[PDB]
């Protein structure tokens, strides 16, 4: 299978950010006096963006302006506990040296995505970092995948989308790309069937070693 470009979700795929999301949520509920809403398992709410997170956490108490509040607090501490998943740096290095173009596409705010990857020193691996706002937060799926690919000059059929959520896989399928599930992330059950299922990041590199995936000059 011949490919040229690999696009990664961020939270729960490249980075283990749940503790820093929890820290921002905490500061958010304190600001807003909504402490009793802090949930028992925050990682259950990670994946769909800050908006989806606050909507499931606050239910009837949700207000659109709270998104800005959360983001403000997350920006005051983008990296405290957050780290790349084990084998992430290794895996990016391997892919890039085989010649793949790499990009990040996620729901996280672009500014925050770039700040986090700078602090973790991963920015270098990526040809393009794309966040929920980059092409407009209101755009329907899979526009961000498509537009990222158009920027990179590459076709969908030559791209692989890696993410831990069924929504990542579903966007790959709408765009007509190949898809891979990242099982090391936050999602405990999945109903999408991707081309590939990865239990650890270095598994990407094994598929390359077996010529199961090859880089297309």
UniProtKB/Swiss-Prot annotation:
Q: What is its EC number?
A: 3.1.3.18
One function term, GO molecular function aspect: phosphoglycolate phosphatase activity
Catalytic residues? 9 (nucleophile)
Which cofactors, if any, are listed as required?
Mg(2+)
Quaternary structure per UniProt? Homodimer.
Among Gene3D superfamilies, the record links this protein to: HAD superfamily/HAD-like, Putative phosphatase, domain 2
Q: Which residues bind substrate?
A: 40-41, 45
Q: Does the keyword Metal-binding apply?
A: yes
Q: Which GO terms describe its cellular component?
A: cytosol
Q: What is the designated name of this protein?
A: Phosphoglycolate phosphatase
NCBIfam families, per the entry: HAD-SF-IA-v1, HAD-SF-IA-v3
What's the stated role of this polypeptide? Specifically catalyzes the dephosphorylation of 2-phosphoglycolate.
Checking Pfam families in the record gives: HAD_2 (PF13419)
* Pathway participation: Organic acid metabolism; glycolate biosynthesis; glycolate from 2-phosphoglycolate: step 1/1
Indicate yes or no for the key word Metal-binding: yes
Name the reaction it catalyses: 2-phosphoglycolate + H2O = glycolate + phosphate
Which key words are in the record? Answer: Carbohydrate metabolism, Hydrolase, Magnesium, Metal-binding
Family, per the entry? Answer: Belongs to the HAD-like hydrolase superfamily. CbbY/CbbZ/Gph/YieH family.
Protein residues bound to Mg(2+): 9, 11, 164
Q: Name one GO biological process term.
A: DNA repair
| UniProt organism field | Aquifex aeolicus (strain VF5)
């Amino acid at each position: 299978m011949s490919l040229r470009v690999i696009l990664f979700d961020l939270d729960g795929t490249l980075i283990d950010s749940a503790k820093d999301i929890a820290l921002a949520l905490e500061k958010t509920l304190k600001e807003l006096g909504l402490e009793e809403y802090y949930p028992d398992n925050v990682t259950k709410y990670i994946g769909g963006g800050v908006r989806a997170l606050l909507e499931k956490v606050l239910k009837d108490k949700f207000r659109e302006e709270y998104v800005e509040v959360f983001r403000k607090h997350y920006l005051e501490n983008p990296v405290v506990y957050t780290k790349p998943y084990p084998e992430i740096p290794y895996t990016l290095e391997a892919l890039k040296s085989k010649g793949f173009k790499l990009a990040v596409v996620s729901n996280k705010l672009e500014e925050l995505s770039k700040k986090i990857l700078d602090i973790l020193n991963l920015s270098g691996y990526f040809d393009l970092i794309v966040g929920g706002d980059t092409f407009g937060e209101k755009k329907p799926s899979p526009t961000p995948v498509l537009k990222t690919l158009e920027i990179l000059g590459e076709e969908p059929e030559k791209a692989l989308i890696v993410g831990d959520t069924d929504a990542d896989i579903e966007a790959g399928k709408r765009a007509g790309t190949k898809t891979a599930l990242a099982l090391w992330g936050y999602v405990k059950l999945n109903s999408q069937i991707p081309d590939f299922t990865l239990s650890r990041p270095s598994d990407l590199v094994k598929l390359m070693d077996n010529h199961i995936v090859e880089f297309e000059g």
